[PDB]
């Protein structure tokens, strides 16, 4: 199993698919989906 | 060799070659091993992985700087949240700049 | 005989002639009779420099260079 | 215009469109 | 809505219309 | 009266407060 | 209600006046 | 998408991993 991770260091940040792909979702979605995911990790953890 | 081939570990197949060793323990402790490594300059790193995440010493070393985890996590929620944190304030804080530029002309008077 | 620096980058391609070089120059036996010299090992086509109080670069490209062959090249600079 | 309407309205748009609302505001205030 | 058009509405409603958007938000979001 | 006068600040708009604060700095 | 009354109605009461319009605004704002 | 499974999958990444999360995050934004 090749984890694949640390593209290259003289780079500009390339993002690993699974890592990032997270980012850009968060972002499209609206405050609505993010409250509620902010009311889960609050109840989570604190 | 044989181990590497078929693993988790599998890209470190050519940084195992020659002569090497390992910094093996139980807690992240990355900044006492590259703090006892500038000791001696000859002697390289030349990375592997910690925590399960495979890097190398250019990404050690700026690693080595990190707080405690769940602060972390609770500091996740707060970017998360720092939009709507940044434009409660700039709701608020034009009532508040008013009461306060008030303040300061009594305390000029 | 003042100062060496090398240069190698497991991260990219692996060649083991620079790395041999290395353990080679690494030795007790050789930094404590160099005193003067200073070695250095930088991780990131390998790069050897050498420079000499003389007014010398020793320039080489352990990559396309044999294990002793680049000590061999070293000893004869340096014992002139 | 209406006050819920607007509240509505940023939930719906999304991280970096609140960003350019608040770097705006800024510019007229 | 538009981003230019929602900076202005902002700007034409009172302070008391504004401390109602600052209750509604919050609660919304928390 | 003391509360009409915060009442007239309250009631005012975010674009002429932009010319209340700003003169307040100038004088 | 016009800006210009505002301005100068913060300059000219006095200290003890505008300590009382601070109180009421916080309730208010 | 799934509000569980984007909150479990946050918990479940590492330190270094929350870390890289946090960071880009803030250059992104601002």
């Known amino acids: 199993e090749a984890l694949a991770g640390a593209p290259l260091d003289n780079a500009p940040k390339e993002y690993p698919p699974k890592i990032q792909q997270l980012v850009q979702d968060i972002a ?17 953890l604190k | 060799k044989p181990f590497l081939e078929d693993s988790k570990y599998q890209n470190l197949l050519p940084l195992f070659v020659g002569h090497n060793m390992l910094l093996v323990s139980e807690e992240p402790k990355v900044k006492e091993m590259v703090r006892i490594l500038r000791t001696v300059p000859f002697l390289p790193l030349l990375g592997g992985c910690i925590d399960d995440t495979i890097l190398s010493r250019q990404g050690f070393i700026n690693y080595s700087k990190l707080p405690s985890l ?32 008030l303040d300061q002309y009594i305390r000029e008077q | 005989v003042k100062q060496v620096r090398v240069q190698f980058c497991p991260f990219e391609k692996n060649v083991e002639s620079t790395r041999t070089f290395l353990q080679t120059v690494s030795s007790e036996k050789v930094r404590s009779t160099n005193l003067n010299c200073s070695v250095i090992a930088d991780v990131r086509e390998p790069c050897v420099d050498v420079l000499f109080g003389d007014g010398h670069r020793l320039i080489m490209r352990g990559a396309h260079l044999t294990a002793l062959e680049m000590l061999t090249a070293f000893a004869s600079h340096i014992r002139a």
């Open chain 2, 70 to 101: 769940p602060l972390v996590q609770g500091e996740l929620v707060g970017g998360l949240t720092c939009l709507t944190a940044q434009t409660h304030s700039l709701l608020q804080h034009q009532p508040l700049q008013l009461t306060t530029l």
């Open chain 1, 28 to 44: 499209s979605l609206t405050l609505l989906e993010i409250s509620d995911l902010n009311e889960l990790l609050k109840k989570t």
